[PDB]
Amino acid sequence: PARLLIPEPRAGRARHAACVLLAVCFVVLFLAPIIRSVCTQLAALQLGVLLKGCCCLAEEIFHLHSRHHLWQVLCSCFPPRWYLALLLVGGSLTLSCLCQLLVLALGLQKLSAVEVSELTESSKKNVAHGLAWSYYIGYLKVVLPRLKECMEELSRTHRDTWKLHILVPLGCDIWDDLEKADSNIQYLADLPETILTRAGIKRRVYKHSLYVIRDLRPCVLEFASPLQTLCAMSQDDCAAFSREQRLEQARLFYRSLRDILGSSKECAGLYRLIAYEEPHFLSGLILWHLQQQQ
Amino acid sequence: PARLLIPEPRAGRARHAACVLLAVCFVVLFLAPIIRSVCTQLAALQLGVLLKGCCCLAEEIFHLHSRHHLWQVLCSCFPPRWYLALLLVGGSLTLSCLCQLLVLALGLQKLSAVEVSELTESSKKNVAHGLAWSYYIGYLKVVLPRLKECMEELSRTHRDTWKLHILVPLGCDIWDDLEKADSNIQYLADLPETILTRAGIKRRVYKHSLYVIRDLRPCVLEFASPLQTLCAMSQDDCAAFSREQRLEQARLFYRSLRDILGSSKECAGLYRLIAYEEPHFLSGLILWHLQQQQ
Amino acid sequence: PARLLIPEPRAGRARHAACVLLAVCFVVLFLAPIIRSVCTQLAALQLGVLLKGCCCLAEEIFHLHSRHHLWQVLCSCFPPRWYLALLLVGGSLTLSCLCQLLVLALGLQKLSAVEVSELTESSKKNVAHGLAWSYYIGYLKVVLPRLKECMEELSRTHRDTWKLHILVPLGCDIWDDLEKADSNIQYLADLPETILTRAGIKRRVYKHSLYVIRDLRPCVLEFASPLQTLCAMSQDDCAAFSREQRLEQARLFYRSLRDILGSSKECAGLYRLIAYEEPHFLSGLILWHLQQQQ
Amino acid sequence: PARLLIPEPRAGRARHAACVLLAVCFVVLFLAPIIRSVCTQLAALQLGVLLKGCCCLAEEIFHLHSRHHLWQVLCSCFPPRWYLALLLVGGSLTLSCLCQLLVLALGLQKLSAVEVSELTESSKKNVAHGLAWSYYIGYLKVVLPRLKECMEELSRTHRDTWKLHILVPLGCDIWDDLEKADSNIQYLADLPETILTRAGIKRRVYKHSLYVIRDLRPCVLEFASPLQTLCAMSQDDCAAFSREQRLEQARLFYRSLRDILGSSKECAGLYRLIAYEEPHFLSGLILWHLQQQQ
Numbered sequence A, B, C, D: 001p002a003r004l005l006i007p008e009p010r011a012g013r014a015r016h017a018a019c020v021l022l023a024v025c026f027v028v029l030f031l032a033p034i035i036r037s038v039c040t041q042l043a044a045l046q047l048g049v050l051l052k053g054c055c056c057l058a059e060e061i062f063h064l065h066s067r068h069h070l071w072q073v074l075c076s077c078f079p080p081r082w083y084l085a086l087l088l089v090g091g092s093l094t095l096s097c098l099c100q101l102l103v104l105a106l107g108l109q110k111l112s113a114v115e116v117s118e119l120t121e122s123s124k125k126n127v128a129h130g131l132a133w134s135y136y137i138g139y140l141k142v143v144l145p146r147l148k149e150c151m152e153e154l155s156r157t158h159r160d161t162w163k164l165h166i167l168v169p170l171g172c173d174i175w176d177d178l179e180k181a182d183s184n185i186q187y188l189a190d191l192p193e194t195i196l197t198r199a200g201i202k203r204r205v206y207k208h209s210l211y212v213i214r215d216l217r218p219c220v221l222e223f224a225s226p227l228q229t230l231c232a233m234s235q236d237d238c239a240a241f242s243r244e245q246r247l248e249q250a251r252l253f254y255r256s257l258r259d260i261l262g263s264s265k266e267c268a269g270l271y272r273l274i275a276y277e278e279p280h281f282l283s284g285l286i287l288w289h290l291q292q293q294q
């Protein structure tokens, strides 16, 4: 199997390194008269933060009813601990205000790549987490409990392997015809369908397929579909989206899906996530996962 | 029809208000000796930004190969115009460094609601835009060109109305049985299906339905499905997601879908977005949209 | 008809404004001892220009036979009036040479948008002029004299309208099926073909089509084809090409084609350039051009 | 085969030679008091660049809506790093301004041959690259996948040679009758045609031809057509275009076509670029390329 390097979540040791550098710099400040001097700089920052809120009253007043329907807007305007800044302003000029305005005009407070990356993958509001929730709720929550009955119905036409391997290709190749993927992968038949009236559509139909892979074992197998969506979210270039970020979002999607099916409760063992990169081959990986459980 | 208040995109007039306040404050500074003093504050900011990059070398060194595979990491570490800060540091102490570290330790640089809102909806990497791209590529790109032929095939069993009204309920109510939605809405039949081998599944089936609404007109009609996903992304509470943000994300989804089908090229006039809030009724709105085109 | 804003050629009034500002600044220098001082700056420029030529001997010596097959290279190296610089250098140091080299190293002589725009559209070597020459020589020079005979041959199966309206959509929409463009535009038949042995291909075939547009008039009509090429020169993104520059290049193409058919001598009145932007409609514009000549 | 000398792309070693001459001149300046003197010359340049922008406000104000529809114009007016010039102007007269205006009036900033050559072939907006994109998209993208089927259809009336040799004569001779090119080249038959509704023309027809060359081998063969366009872009003299630049543009065209078919993905091996100069002969070169693959 190929080496799976998916990124871990952020541990948050940067604050620890900042604290250590703070303590070391205080020790070198060792080897009372200057503490007031600290305040002469400190509220100098906390003015400008307030200034940012003042400018954020600018556009938000054009969004009163359409986004916020007064006190809600000013509640949303500045960071929530606003009284510390005024508390520090009271404990004491135009140069500071003009410097903060000269910063805020030219826009030199642009965050870097790693900061927006941690802000993206920290919140659960990016593309990959929402799309993984869509794939979990819309498909996997519904089909997977009805898998064993259709398997038994085809059985009247190996109980360890009655699962649903989801191929998750961390990359670009997504194929509709898996018989073009290898000469070893062969189509045999399909499962009995599933009929559900979902979201106004009456009798929506979910299907499957059964693939026999030999040298001599059957399995159910399909691709994780919405990666295909990402495959058109950068090729068509109508979304601001790059290939390196495409690989990043695919790894994030596999990580989020692994997390969701980790704390899943209905999906007992019926799923089996197979993920890979491009280093024939795919049948060899399928056979390795298939023999691994036995 | 109900009043549709969807939020406009950010115009960006806050920078203009900052510039105006800058010019006015410079005029009051009117009515050369102090400009060097500006630099004594100015690089005082640009040190600390560099300090943030120093702390962002901390956790990123635990993410060398798993996210970035040296120079790529330091390239991603600080904001890209790094030389202006060192240029300003050269033009001239421990108090400034300790103040910036004391800020970065306690974490008082937390962005407000409106800043993270503009950062979210500014980039095309939130939940609603990616999910709208999924609904456009997976379903609307495929089905809609094959609509007229199925309509003509049922016609051999009103050409102005041969469309697909997508009900987009900006709210919480999403129903599977539209006959429970009103006594006026009646199910009649379904369109001939669509069979496509998509993403490894052989013979995936797309269906539709035809609803006759009288007092005396037929139409095709369905719900925008993945809003249902959002309806379970906060009720189950396994995602950090609120109801006010649910209404916000639904309005954002309708806006993004309106934008995508605005610049669409295959979907000629075959879609017709109907969106509403909860103020019987739904049939009255459907009849108003249906009579509006004629 | 929509308002056609195509850009005029460059008149060249910027040199006039420079001359006026020169004369005014000389008048303020009024209200002999300093003229030598002028030379102390003046050759200071004309050294560095020579320096640019010295650095342009660098890469060109790697291109001796492959691009230039000595005296040809140095002839091509610097600007052609080289003796004025040495003439000014003789009339009199290391600071000037080091300043010019410090400029040429960091590359601060990067031209702006308007300068490269005037340099592009000034020379007849851009994309749009060459592609318009291709469309004039390859197609319009050959087909158009043989139009009336094919029209008369279909006439034995309104002489004011026997022309070839070339639709030039200044934009993005280019359609292969003009019957999908409007319900009013209808296909009737095609002209008799044209057979020519061109560029090694024996019996290359040129065709046409005849469209009847009613409410009750026929016309010949086709799209300006190579705009489609521009439609794939930025969407596929394999060329450095933007949409705003796509609209600019399309307007430039229509202007160049209008110029070429202006001074044309074989194409008497048989062409009729119809161009438009996107504000049904297209048939209305076609009927307006069709009724305008009568 | 004749020696193919096509020009390589610009490597960019001239900046390296400038940097080396800078370092050597600094070393001779070795073997603090003068650095301010540098600035007394340095902003003396950066004023005049700003002056160029001032004069470029002159004609552009006559092009407000017709090319740019204020802030867009001034954004396009000067080079984008405008603040460095004012930053250097602040760190300190009429002689400098009058010298820069006296330069800009007489127009002694005319670029040389090699500078406009690198600016032309550097950007992808010259004649040859756009015309090569036209020949790739309009013809080679469409015909070449349908080649093998027509070859097999004539085969039912040597699989290594089923290709399309494009003759690219880097020169002036382009002939319509290849049987006049040599007694050895003989016409036999033509391929089955290709019918496509392209750009409003219904049933546009693409053809081919099959040439048997003996002493005893067949091949498909045609000329690169739009070189013929260049053959009329200087002979008719309606475009500013010379014969030496004609050979240069032809070599540039062959290089760009070689690059495009290098990164091509549909055209597997079906093309085979044959290019030559004029030193019978052409059949000998064709036979050498034909025997080379076997």
Ligand SMILES: Nc1nc(=O)c2ncn([C@@H]3O[C@@H]4COP(=O)(O)O[C@H]5[C@@H](O)[C@H](n6cnc7c(N)ncnc76)O[C@@H]5COP(=O)(O)O[C@@H]3[C@@H]4O)c2[nH]1
Residues within 6 Å of the ligand: A134, A135, A138, A139, A199, A201, A204, A205, A206, A207, A225, A226, A229, B134, B135, B138, B139, B201, B204, B205, B206, B207, B222, B225, B226, B229
């Ligand atoms: N009304 C309706 N009838 C349909 O048959 C249908 N099929 C898809 N869709 C909607 O279009 C989109 C395309 O599916 P996508 O591939 O992007 O992810 C889909 C897909 O990965 C998976 N899935 C759903 N149905 C099938 C199916 N029949 N076969 C395979 N996978 C399916 O579950 C994901 C989410 O489905 P929904 O989020 O409930 O609505 C889908 C989806 O929004 C449908 N909508």
Ligand SMILES: Nc1nc(=O)c2ncn([C@@H]3O[C@@H]4COP(=O)(O)O[C@H]5[C@@H](O)[C@H](n6cnc7c(N)ncnc76)O[C@@H]5COP(=O)(O)O[C@@H]3[C@@H]4O)c2[nH]1
Residues within 6 Å of the ligand: C134, C135, C138, C139, C201, C204, C205, C206, C207, C222, C225, C226, C229, D134, D135, D138, D139, D199, D201, D204, D205, D206, D207, D225, D226, D229
């Ligand atoms: N409407 C229409 N019907 C035609 O039959 C036709 N034939 C040519 N053209 C247009 O005129 C011009 C002349 O072709 P050129 O030789 O300069 O390069 C042409 C030519 O090199 C090649 N090509 C296209 N069709 C053929 C063809 N039948 N035979 C050989 N070569 C062809 O592809 C190039 C680009 O074609 P288009 O860029 O899509 O439009 C062409 C072109 O703009 C046509 N336009």
